[PDB]
Amino acid sequence: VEKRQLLTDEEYRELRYGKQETYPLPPGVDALVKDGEEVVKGQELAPGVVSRLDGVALYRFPRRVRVEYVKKERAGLRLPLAAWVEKEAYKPGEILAELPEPYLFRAEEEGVVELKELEEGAFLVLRREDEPVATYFLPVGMTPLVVHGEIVEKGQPLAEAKGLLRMPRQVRAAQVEAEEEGETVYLTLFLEWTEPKDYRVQPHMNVVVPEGARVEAGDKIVAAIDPEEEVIAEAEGVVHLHEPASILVVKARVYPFEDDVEVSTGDRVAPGDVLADGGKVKSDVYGRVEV
Amino acid sequence: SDPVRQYLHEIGQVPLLTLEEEVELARKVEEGMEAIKKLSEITGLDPDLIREVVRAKILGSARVRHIPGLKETLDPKTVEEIDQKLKSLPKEHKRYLHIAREGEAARQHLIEANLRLVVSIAKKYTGRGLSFLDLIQEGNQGLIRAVEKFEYKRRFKFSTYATWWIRQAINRAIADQARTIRIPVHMVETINKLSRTARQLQQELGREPTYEEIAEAMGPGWDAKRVEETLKIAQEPVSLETPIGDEKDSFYGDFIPDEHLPSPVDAATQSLLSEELEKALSKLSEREAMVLKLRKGLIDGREHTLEEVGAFFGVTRERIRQIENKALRKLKYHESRTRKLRDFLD
DNA sequence: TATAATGGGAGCTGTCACGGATGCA
DNA sequence: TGCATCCGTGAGTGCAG
């Protein structure tokens, strides 16, 4: 565009403020793409919603915040020796034993059952008075034969194994200790996995954590007007955003940082100028800064 | 072409907020002010002087003008200068320069977003001395007030709180610039009182009321006299170019004499006096026709009582008051021959 | 100062002729 | 390039009014 040229208002907003277009989604319907996501024209962003330009989509208002909280603990399982595969760990989905015929996994203490079911798989915890006695781990293929809140003595069947049994996919086998005795081995696996707890964000509140951020106990996820109805992070986990109000498909260029930023929000800038971090990160394009 | 459909169109571009974007922008504006005096007591400069600098850099150098009230002239050198001992702070202190900047940016989108609301209020204050747009702009003017005073935490929509400052600001303009003769906003307020109460009186009586029928229903401290002189200051002037006749070859102003400047009769009548009285000082004595020519003025007047009379006349204080009598005396006999003075008393 | 309120409203008519500046096959 | 076509500018005097 040359000196002494007549631009309409929109034209001037493009050249001076840049293209961007926000799209609403049917309330509840989730995001076929997700936050931070670079995308381009005609690309499906939700069942009925598709973008008509290029750029870096951004989430507006997540109504559903899910925290995958992290667990690392110790659980055991006894199996026939001629039916388990030897490995010192079990990547998720990884087959760890196969049983010729069904074999019943029996108790090795007495107490009340604390059943803890997972997407695929299950935990079983026994306890005489409210101290724990044992933590058994049912993999995939072992079908529990108890209910939560239930009494078992030594040696009655808890689960039944049938055929192949494999690790679940959310769950890891960090280290695996085995010990033979009789015609069985009893693994104490150092399992690792995470659990979903879905939080609801309300119109007068604002999630204050990015996508995939790490938090400890205490850390604040959502804020609100009154200190109640805030969501604090129960303990260690990391965050996820589903169900935004709608998503803004900007045409910009993102540049993460690690330390103090040298440019504030509002600044005009060209390529090559020093954005943040002592001069490492720098501008690709001509454009308009948004810290 | 039509300067209202024009503005009705620019407005129709900024989308209306939704409940989250409402509370988002409002929230950011609140926090940004907090940020600004946290940002003030760290560096110790001044909240406002600091606020204008946030303001400049967000809107662009497009606008900057030495803001009345700030102590230094806010020229683009002091905005780089001061934006410097700003970005000079630790990431946990210069944390708030990003907060302010975000605030000012949300200030705007929240004003710009809610202009269609002002329109829908000024629309019904028409025909009151101010034009639609004039009313809109005033309306807007108040809207700005509404954001710097909003409290998103009270949970009310924005519409609700602003519909107060908006009409508060129309109504102050309708009442401060409408009349060619500006009358304090409170006198304007009581005037409208007479109007509205007179109207009901008429709707009650079947005829317009008298002065006293107003002073009664207007209550105590109100007499007929005081309703009357209130109405005559209520009185709006009229155009010198008002049309006289159904043609247009005479102006109401053309039938209005110019009382101020002297007429040629008067102009001449003055010059013949102020010398045929100089034609009665140099007739008997010109130093007694000079000390009483300085007991008043040939031009400017010189007359007090006893004080400069006592300074430089040559003579003592109550001796000039005696040749004051004889200077006058001589003129009262002097002016029984040159009797050409009586006419000048009209 | 706090429910909520979010794009206007009235056109005016029955002259004419010339000269200039602009749009269009 | 030549010619519709629109926009802007004029349209008597004085006196009573």
Query: Quick one: angle between helices B19-43 and B132-149, nearest 10?
Result: 60
Structural domain includes residue B254: no
Which nucleotide is closest to the Cα of B5 by its C1'? C8
| Judgement on whether residues B211 and B283 belong to the same structural domain of the protein | no
| Judgement on whether residues B132 and B171 belong to the same structural domain of the protein | yes
| Judgement on whether residues B197 and B143 belong to the same structural domain of the protein | no
Instruction: Report which residue is nearest nucleotide C4 when distances run from CA to C1'.
Output: B160
Domain count, chain B: 3
Residues ≥6 apart with Cβ < 8 Å to B112: B14
| Judgement on whether residues B194 and B145 belong to the same structural domain of the protein | no
DSSP string, B138-174: HHHHHHHHHHHH--GGG---HHHHHHHHHHHHHHHHH
Sign, CA dihedral B83-B85-B88-B91, equals negative
| Judgement on whether residues B128 and B229 belong to the same structural domain of the protein | no
Final residue before a domain boundary, out of B162, B179, B196: B179
Q: How far is CA A136 from the centre of its chain?
A: 25
Final residue before a domain boundary, out of B133, B151, B179: B179
Do β-strands A237-242 and A214-215 pair in parallel, antiparallel, or remain unpaired? antiparallel
Chain A residue with the nearest C-alpha to that of B20: A203
Three-state DSSP class for A99? strand
Residue A259: its chain B contacts at CB < 8 A?
Answer: 91
Q: Which two tokens stand for residue B200?
A: 């009901």
Which of A265, A268, A273, A277 has the highest number of chain B CBs within 10 A, making it the mutation to test binding with B? A265
Answer whether any strand C atom is within 7 A of the Cβ of B30. Answer: no
Which residue in B75, B76, B99 sits closest to B89, CA to CA?
B99
Range of the domain at B226: 183-236
* CB-neighbour burial class of residue A198 (10 A; exposed 0-12, middle 13-18, buried 19+): exposed
DSSP string, A19-80: -EEEEE--TT---SS-TT-EE-TT-EEETTEE-SS-EEEEE---SEEEEEEEEE--EEEEEE
| Judgement on whether residues B150 and B208 belong to the same structural domain of the protein | no
Which residue in B58, B33, B95 sits closest to A261, CA to CA?
B95
Residue type, A78: R
| Judgement on whether residues B111 and B61 belong to the same structural domain of the protein | yes
Helix (H) or strand (E) holding A257: none
Answer whether any strand D atom is within 7 A of the Cβ of B244. Answer: yes
Residue B13: its chain A contacts at CB < 8 A?
Answer: 9
Three-state DSSP class for A171? coil
User: Cα separation of A106 and B57, whole Å?
Assistant: 72
Report the 10 Å Cβ neighbour count for A167: 24
User: Cα separation of A33 and A37, whole Å?
Assistant: 7
Q: How many CA atoms lie within 13 A of A6 on its CB side?
A: 0
Helix (H) or strand (E) holding A87: none
User: Cα separation of B34 and B41, whole Å?
Assistant: 11
Resolution of the experimental structure, in angstroms: 3.0
Residue B58: its chain A contacts at CB < 8 A?
Answer: 265-266
Do β-strands A184-200 and A172-177 pair in parallel, antiparallel, or remain unpaired? antiparallel
Query: What single DSSP character describes residue A107?
Result: P
Structural domain includes residue B321: yes
The CATH code of the domain that includes B125 is 1.20.120.1810
Residues ≥6 apart with Cβ < 8 Å to A141: A161, A162, A163, A164, A165, A166
* CB-neighbour burial class of residue B29 (10 A; exposed 0-12, middle 13-18, buried 19+): buried
Q: Which two tokens stand for residue B183?
A: 């009358």
| Judgement on whether residues B204 and B287 belong to the same structural domain of the protein | no
Structural domain includes residue B242: no
Structural domain includes residue B159: yes
Which residue in B206, B178, B205, B204 sits closest to B191, CA to CA?
B178
| Judgement on whether residues B173 and B37 belong to the same structural domain of the protein | yes
| Judgement on whether residues B268 and B135 belong to the same structural domain of the protein | no
Burial readout B167-200 (b: 16 or more C-beta within 10 A, e: otherwise): bebbbebbbeeeeeeeeeeeebeebeebeebbee
- A151 and A112 in contact (C-beta within 8 Å)? yes
Structural domain includes residue B249: no
Which of A12, A15, A202, A204 has the highest number of chain B CBs within 10 A, making it the mutation to test binding with B? A204
Helix (H) or strand (E) holding A116: strand A111-117
Q: Does A291 sit within 8 Å of B91, measured CB to CB?
A: no
The distance (Å) linking the CA of B156 with the C1' of C1 is: 13
- A75 and A108 in contact (C-beta within 8 Å)? no
User: Cα separation of A160 and A145, whole Å?
Assistant: 7
Answer whether any strand C atom is within 7 A of the Cβ of B153. Answer: no
Question: Among B21, B97, B155, whose Cβ lies nearest the Cβ of A264?
Answer: B97
For tokens 């069947």, the residue is A157
Sign, CA dihedral B259-B265-B271-B277, equals negative
DSSP string, A235-253: SSEEEEEE--SEEEEE---
Three-state DSSP class for B262? coil
Structural domain includes residue B198: yes
Which residue in A187, A183, A129, A138 sits closest to A162, CA to CA?
A138
Method: X-ray
Final residue before a domain boundary, out of B140, B162, B179: B179
Chain B residue with the nearest C-alpha to that of A224: B153
Q: How many CA atoms lie within 13 A of A47 on its CB side?
A: 7
User: Cα separation of B171 and B142, whole Å?
Assistant: 10
Answer whether any strand D atom is within 7 A of the Cβ of B245. Answer: yes
The CATH code of the domain that includes B300 is 1.10.10.10
Structural domain includes residue B86: yes
The residue count for chain B = 346
Which residue in A13, A55, A15, A11 sits closest to A33, CA to CA?
A55
- B83 and B61 in contact (C-beta within 8 Å)? no
How large is the C-alpha radius of gyration of chain A?
A: 27
Q: Does A60 sit within 8 Å of B20, measured CB to CB?
A: yes
Query: What single DSSP character describes residue B219?
Result: -
- B52 and B102 in contact (C-beta within 8 Å)? no
For tokens 């900024």, the residue is B14
Structural domain includes residue B253: no
User: Cα separation of B21 and B16, whole Å?
Assistant: 9
Q: How many CA atoms lie within 13 A of A257 on its CB side?
A: 17
User: Cα separation of A52 and B238, whole Å?
Assistant: 61
- B147 and B29 in contact (C-beta within 8 Å)? yes
User: Cα separation of B335 and B342, whole Å?
Assistant: 9
Instruction: Give A203→chain B minimum CA distance, Å.
Output: 5
Which residue in A115, A112, A113, A134 sits closest to A123, CA to CA?
A115
| Judgement on whether residues B22 and B115 belong to the same structural domain of the protein | yes
Q: Which two tokens stand for residue A107?
A: 């108790």
| Judgement on whether residues B16 and B148 belong to the same structural domain of the protein | yes
User: Cα separation of A169 and A172, whole Å?
Assistant: 8
- A146 and A158 in contact (C-beta within 8 Å)? yes
Query: Quick one: angle between helices B115-122 and B95-113, nearest 10?
Result: 40
